[PDB]
Design a protein around this ligand. Sequence first.
Ligand SMILES: Nc1ncnc2c1ncn2[C@@H]1O[C@H](COP(=O)(O)OP(=O)(O)OP(=O)(O)O)[C@@H](O)[C@H]1O
Ligand SMILES: [Mg+2]
Ligand SMILES: [Zn+2]
Lengths: 289, 286, 70, 146, 51
Amino acid sequence: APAVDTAEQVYISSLALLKMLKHGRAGVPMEVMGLMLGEFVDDYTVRVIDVFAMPQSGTGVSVEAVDPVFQAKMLDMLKQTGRPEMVVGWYHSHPGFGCWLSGVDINTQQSFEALSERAVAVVVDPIQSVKGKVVIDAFRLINANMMVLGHEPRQTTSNLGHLNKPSIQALIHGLNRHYYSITINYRKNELEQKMLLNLHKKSWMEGLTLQDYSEHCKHNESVVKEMLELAKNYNKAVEEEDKMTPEQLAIKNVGKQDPKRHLEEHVDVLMTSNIVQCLAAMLDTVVFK
Amino acid sequence: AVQKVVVHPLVLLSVVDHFNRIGKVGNQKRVVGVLLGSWQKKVLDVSNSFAVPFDEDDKDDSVWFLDHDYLENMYGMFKKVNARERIVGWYHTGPKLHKNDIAINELMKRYCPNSVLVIIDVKPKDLGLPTEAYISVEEVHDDGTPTSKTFEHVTSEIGAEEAEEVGVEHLLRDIKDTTVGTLSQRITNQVHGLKGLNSKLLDIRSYLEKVATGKLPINHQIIYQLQDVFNLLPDVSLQEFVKAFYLKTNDQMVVVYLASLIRSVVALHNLINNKIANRDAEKKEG
Amino acid sequence: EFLHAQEEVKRIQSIPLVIGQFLEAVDQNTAIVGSTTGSNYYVRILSTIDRELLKPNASVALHKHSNALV
Amino acid sequence: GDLVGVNKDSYLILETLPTEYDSRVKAMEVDERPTEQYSDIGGLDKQIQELVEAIVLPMNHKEKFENLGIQPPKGVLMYGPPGTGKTLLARACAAQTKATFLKLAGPQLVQMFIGDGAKLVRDAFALAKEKAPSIIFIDELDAIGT
Amino acid sequence: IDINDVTPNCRVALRNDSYTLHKILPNKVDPLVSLMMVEKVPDSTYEMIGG
Ligand SMILES: Nc1ncnc2c1ncn2[C@@H]1O[C@H](COP(=O)(O)OP(=O)(O)OP(=O)(O)O)[C@@H](O)[C@H]1O
Ligand SMILES: [Mg+2]
Ligand SMILES: [Zn+2]
């Protein structure tokens, strides 16, 4: 009895994640879908390299949405460019709903699984995955005939609880009962991170620009005024030094206030801004004549 | 004219994929593709791309083939997937332009008149900005010189729309620098700037040497612009500025001094509070 | 990590943000704010937020999806 | 004002939806004016002749009405203590003057379904424009006249 | 949670998705009938009340 060891990973290339997130936000009010191109490198790893959007259609995210003419032609044309990958799965967004598969989605997944027993299905909520977090869980139908044996039929391994724990907002929509998640791991490699690092990279000119002194003097004057009032409290807070259980005094007056947090916290800002500005000032005086 | 060609992160991450697709087996030079994107007032937005079978020969530098039907059919599919994209130019990862660029650009002019070619130096990972955007202009060169095709330059800048931005930020998530900067990173921002300004000035010197040694044609234009930069220098030695610099340097030191003192009194107060803490616990142990 | 951590927390106060009224307080780092949506929600309180500006009518902002006082 | 069909998610107008004045609206075109012949309404004569001056006559002999310049008042409110028979002479001008008589009693124009009576109103005049000389009669106008 | 603590008219909090009770929460007093509770004692003392 073959089994998807929990160690099994669905490798998502740096390309796919941007393209899958892009498609999801493209039609965010509605639901988008497309086939994912990859290889079943072995039992314990389902590698997805590229994804190509299957055009939005009124059916929604269902078997019917998979236009055989569009897919047969697109695959044929991607084979010439140098991407002879096989259809490894399908993905569809879920405008804010979560990372779960509904009844209709399950029927799709069962279809894809018909062609290969490892066709992984993913989600990609473009509304929740709005910050550093990317809500994209992979899923493979756990055939209902394996209720006699162990669901999530894993074997020797120990990465089942790692990288995630069963999310509650999904466990309710059928997990370890009809669909199980597969650990998602991104195959970012050098020569791809470096090109993405340019997204917010500054430039040579930056770092030598001296800020502007009119708002710098105002800023220096502003912060020094604010720190001054914070010293007044520091004097009152210390000069009080009330000893009625001072260890308890230091814990009954914690509100992110005078003593230190609004203290030198500003010193670092004030001193970092000046030192960098000054050093820029003197470097320019040397470099530029 | 196109003021800017903002290349989204996804394109340079598909081109990298496109270079790897082929170079891995069919070792070859630049990989050519089509660049889709939405227009703006004047800033062309590059939002996606795809590959086009392109084969070239080092002989005659005009035995090439950029497939037409593949370009036509591909876009036929993509306008179905997303309709805000129109063909807007091409990309090739060969760092140095070829003699075939003009002729091929004329082709892509058949699909978008204001076609901009964006050279993505996929192989290099260096000072930065791995995109260089070019247009096609045919002018009489005002100043009495032969006419020709030539590629004019258009300012390139790499930006990100919201969706790709979220993916990219997580995609690094292991080498991203703190946005606050802090003293450590701010200073490195300047050793980095000095290295560039030298590097840019050294490219200028080599070219000036080339024109000086004749190996290159005196542009007669942009050549004196470099002369413009050479007059825009500050001349700091001026007394009236020398006084005004010490005042602001002195204006700041009195703030770093006040900053320094506060951090010192806080330091001593923290040792006195701590000296009491361990001592009091010292006696209290008995 | 600390600077990333603060930045990541600072990301929680990103825009968009639903608006709700600070009905009451249950304890430190928690709240009973009631969203403008029409439903009252038991949410969490961001530490950086000041428990002195949470007056029991305050029109505080709640995270759109996670719906937590931010 | 057009009632179009739009996508439940995108909210893009897909298809203009025909009105056809629903079915109720055309139902209020009762053709069985009970024949409240002015021999059946009594005592209210000067009232009877007066409406025949502002209706029937204005609608029937409009050619002379056009030359005179005497614009015939489009409406006439029927006020008076209950039991005077206002709905009755109304039929009298309704029946013994022909016309279509789309009676739209105000009480019916109170529907808890948002934007229905208003649609019933604009349509009623819309249903009114389609047909030949008629009278749009609204009884108990207090129901929406409040 | 011990069910003995769930008296009628409590203000338990229910989880976001599975609707399970997981806290009793402070009891609900109308927003206007709660400002009526003196939180700040005034500053008029008996020694200022003569006669
Ligand atoms: N002039 C009349 N001759 C004969 N019957 C009359 C006359 N006026 C009213 N009636 C009778 O009075 C009754 C009331 O009908 P109708 O609805 O017309 O009264 P109404 O005064 O219009 O009522 P309301 O003003 O409360 O709507 C009917 O039986 C009607 O025939
Ligand atoms: Mg009546
Ligand atoms: Zn779905």
